[PDB]
Design a protein around this ligand. Sequence first.
Ligand SMILES: [Au+]
Ligand SMILES: [Au+]
Ligand SMILES: [Au+]
Ligand SMILES: [Au+]
Ligand SMILES: [Au+]
Ligand SMILES: [Au+]
Length: 260
Amino acid sequence: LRPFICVNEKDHLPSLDPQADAWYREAVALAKPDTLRPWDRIVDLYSKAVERGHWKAMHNLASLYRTGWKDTQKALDLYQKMIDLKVPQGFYDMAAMIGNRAGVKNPATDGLTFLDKAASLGNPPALTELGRLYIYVAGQDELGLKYTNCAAGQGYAPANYELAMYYRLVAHNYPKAAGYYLLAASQGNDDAAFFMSGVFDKTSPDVDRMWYAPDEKLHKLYDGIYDQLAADPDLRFPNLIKDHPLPPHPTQGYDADRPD
Ligand SMILES: [Au+]
Ligand SMILES: [Au+]
Ligand SMILES: [Au+]
Ligand SMILES: [Au+]
Ligand SMILES: [Au+]
Ligand SMILES: [Au+]
């Protein structure tokens, strides 16, 4: 991807067939892991949707084949169908399965690795993974941050978790980092909610708190958020940030670059 150009994945997706999407949505509802799942019906619905070109159904069904409830080749075939439709997620899935470097051998990538192709089409998982490699392995912080923010901007929670970790561990901008942890947690990110559950705990060491002062109310709040989310990954917390603004940081205020 040179030069790096950030695009929105939505501008590179096939339209979804209405009947197909009805079938997909019904299968998704039936397949919720915290319910007693009717596997035959779920596979049937996904399969009907796949026959009418639904790429999200291809993705979910391929996952089911990868784990069983196992058919490696059926999963691979589905990923290839997605790639055939130039679905960005398809390139990501193929990378995540057989490896990134094999992408150069696939004609649909045009001599790009699978992740590079996916990221070129705006895929937030690929953007997040490559951004991570640029920051921590290549030492190209600014470029990796551009990748990561391109994914975060599309509402991708794990990318907000990566930004939080960067600003906490590398930049040491704790209010910024906390803003990103809270954003990821609100969007359902388990890692982020877990970290936030320790930040205002008086029994946490200073570094776990990012040197915030302990706060009983906020500890109970974020401990509760994490409790809920840990049991049910589908929860979101759309009001969390605005209903409970962050206290000022004892030395960094509301931005380490502008302590005042
Ligand atoms: Au496209
Ligand atoms: Au998935
Ligand atoms: Au540092
Ligand atoms: Au507490
Ligand atoms: Au609240
Ligand atoms: Au509050």
